[PDB]
Design a protein around this ligand. Structure first.
Ligand SMILES: NC(=O)c1cccnc1
Ligand SMILES: NC(=O)c1cccnc1
Ligand SMILES: [Zn+2]
Ligand SMILES: [Zn+2]
Lengths: 326, 325
């Protein structure tokens, strides 16, 4: 069909009406996925918070998730706490809740390992992750193969002078609900808290350090667009895992990838606004094991003995859709 | 250049923001245009009604244009006489005015011949025209090279049964302000329009000329051609149009960003970013260009035009006002 180029906005936003992607006639099964796995050389793996919940890290949207906790505190719109423009206006909104999102460290799931597997077999084009928990590097995913789409707490930057430090340096202030302040800006900040130097032209974010996670309304890290420009030209399988796919531009990856490329979902819930070729509905750690196993592969993670020794049930439930339990 | 995804172009005629195109840094003089004409092999020319005003045919929105001559109708939007929903509901609204848009025959302007000139030098990839006057044929522009984006009176079609006939078979009815009726639907038509159910529209068994109405799909040659042409185009020249109707007005967004885009038109096109804009009458600016290229426009008015002195006054970077005296 006739098309022109529509610029993909690179500011983090709710994506939020039929999807127009057409599903491949030739690719619906589990066995189709398996043969593709054996032949593919340039797999794109797109992950979300689902791939870290086996580790006790909440996701965003589910019943025990972050949004539910922020709402229970009393915020009318819990989305507010990760809003960039809100941060720039009032950084206490985010720093009032930031201790809740500071991640654990040095752990990873069977899924992160299934990703490293692909890398080791020379098949991973990129893992585009939405997660700010920074668990991919520890899991062994190489830095050239990882795109932290929405950043991480690895570093924090002053919004005023752009001085950058390791995130760890501000964790104790975050645990104690204290505003992390830039040491270089601090003297002007005290002066402010000339017309241009007074209310309303100086914002409350003046000289405040912000973790280098991407907020809603902020530009994604440059690694994202630079990578996807190229990975789009060459991807030959797309797997989406442990995400609702509600945040653009990450959510647009499904539309940017060329239409002949097979797209697979592994997730607890179907993604209604997308048209995956194959959907595998269940726990990602379980479905990973199952898939590796059908492939005659192993997942280099401790839990693999155990996961591999289960009885997996794959119930067809409409074409190209399986409910996987065990 | 910005990371992009594919967006389907809507193929329904629609009267049409900000423009995203970046102008070429190395192309903004008249000499850049002359040099490019020498080397280009796959030129897309997009025309509108300004290419026939020299022949005495009104354009649409000038002060003596078609919309000015139907002011007495008192329409909120005078384009409604060419609206498709209006046609389907009540074809007498179009048929009152259709006589005014029947084409003359066997005449064409120096700008039409400039296009044919390009053709016979092997440089015309396509002439996308919005005109229904069919004058490109008379000028020698080939059917293969012509896309009548908004159709023509060549054929007419029954809106009910789809019977297709030569468009000239309805001209005498058009001239008499009568509805041209389909001979196959006529028996049912006469039953309903001597009981009639409320879901039978007034267009039942009415012939429609195969011009594209506002709200109607474009002819199939348009999307078939443009898809291939934007891959090969090496120069776009937009002439005698306000560029206010989509999807034609999207051609300038669809051509890849590196292809030079030139406007030749009485007025700037404020919602587009042309690399070079030449502002004046088509025929004169075509002649001046052909002169500068050391070329000949194959038109009886060539000897008159080649005898004019053209002044090109640079207004802004890539904007020139071209007059004659
Ligand atoms: N509890 C949270 O707010 C949270 C933590 C980690 C990931 N997602 C959400
Ligand atoms: N013959 C025509 O196409 C025409 C177009 C606009 C105004 N008058 C006539
Ligand atoms: Zn600072
Ligand atoms: Zn009929």
């Amino acid at each position: 069909p006739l098309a022109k180029k529509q610029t993909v906005r690179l500011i983090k936003d709710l994506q939020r009406v039929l999807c127009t992607r057409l599903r491949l006639s030739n690719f619906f099964t589990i066995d189709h996925f398996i043969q593709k796995l054996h032949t593919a050389r340039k797999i794109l793996v797109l992950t979300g918070a689902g791939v870290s919940t086996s580790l006790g890290i909440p996701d965003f949207r589910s019943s025990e998730g972050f949004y539910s906790k922020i709402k229970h505190l009393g915020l009318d719109d819990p989305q507010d706490v990760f809003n960039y423009n809100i941060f720039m206006h009032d950084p206490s909104v985010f720093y009032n809740i930031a201790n809740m999102v500071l991640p654990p460290e040095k752990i990873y799931s069977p899924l992160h390992s299934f990703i490293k597997m692909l890398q080791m077999k020379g098949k991973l084009l990129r893992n585009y992750t939405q997660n700010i928990d920074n668990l991919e590097s520890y899991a062994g995913i190489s830095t050239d193969k990882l795109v932290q789409c929405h950043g991480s707490f690895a570093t924090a930057t002053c919004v005023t002078c752009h001085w950058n430090l390791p995130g760890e340096r501000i964790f104790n202030k975050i645990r104690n609900l204290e505003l992390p302040l830039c040491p270089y800006c601090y003297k002007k900040r005290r002066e402010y808290f000339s017309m241009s130097e007074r209310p309303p032209y100086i914002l409350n974010s003046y000289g405040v350090l912000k973790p280098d996670i991407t907020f809603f309304g902020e530009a994604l890290p440059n690694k994202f667009h630079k990578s996807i420009r190229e990975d789009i030209l060459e991807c030959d399988l797309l797997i989406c895992i442990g995400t609702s796919l509600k945040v653009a531009p990450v959510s647009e990856i499904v539309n940017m990838v060329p239409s002949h490329v097979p797209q697979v979902l592994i997730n607890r819930d179907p993604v209604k606004h997308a048209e995956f070729d194959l959907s595998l509905l269940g726990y990602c750690d379980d479905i990973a094991a199952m898939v590796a196993q059908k492939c005659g592969w192993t997942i280099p993670h401790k839990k693999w003995n155990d996961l591999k020794n289960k009885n997996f049930k794959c119930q067809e439930k409409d074409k190209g859709v399986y409910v996987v339990t065990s």
